[PDB]
Amino acid sequence: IESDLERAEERAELSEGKCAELEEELKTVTNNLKSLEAQ
Amino acid sequence: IESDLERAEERAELSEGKCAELEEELKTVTNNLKSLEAQ
């Protein structure tokens, strides 16, 4: 169960980092879309 | 350790669910941006 918990924490950290990066990417993409939609 | 694994799996699977929703949101907004920029 300890061996289970360590890899569970590792994948959780990886997923959280990926989610944060994708949230930043979403913010940038929607900012560019809003800027381009003016024309 | 069992309790730790339980709530770890809980918020982990919540994280991948949110990540998948964010992935599809990025895909659709990118498609919309490409469609607008095509013309």
Side-chain angles (χ1 to χ4, degrees):
Chain A
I1 62 174
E2 285 181 320
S3 182
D4 291 331
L5 168 70
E6 45 180 282
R7 315 152 301 121
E9 289 188 309
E10 290 306 297
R11 314 161 261 171
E13 180 183 290
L14 179 56
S15 65
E16 193 175 296
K18 192 155 65 178
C19 199
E21 192 271 331
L22 284 157
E23 269 165 353
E24 181 57 58
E25 195 171 353
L26 171 73
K27 187 51 69 184
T28 56
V29 162
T30 194
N31 197 1
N32 296 115
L33 190 148
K34 260 69 177 175
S35 68
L36 189 150
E37 207 182 65
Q39 305 89 294
Chain B
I1 297 295
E2 272 191 351
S3 64
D4 294 356
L5 273 165
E6 285 164 348
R7 82 292 183 276
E9 193 169 67
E10 190 272 332
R11 84 289 183 275
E13 70 91 19
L14 188 135
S15 198
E16 289 90 7
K18 293 309 290 179
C19 180
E21 187 172 294
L22 198 48
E23 282 287 333
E24 62 92 20
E25 283 174 351
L26 269 295
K27 188 181 176 183
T28 185
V29 298
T30 312
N31 194 256
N32 290 318
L33 184 134
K34 184 181 178 183
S35 61
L36 275 296
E37 199 178 66
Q39 49 81 31

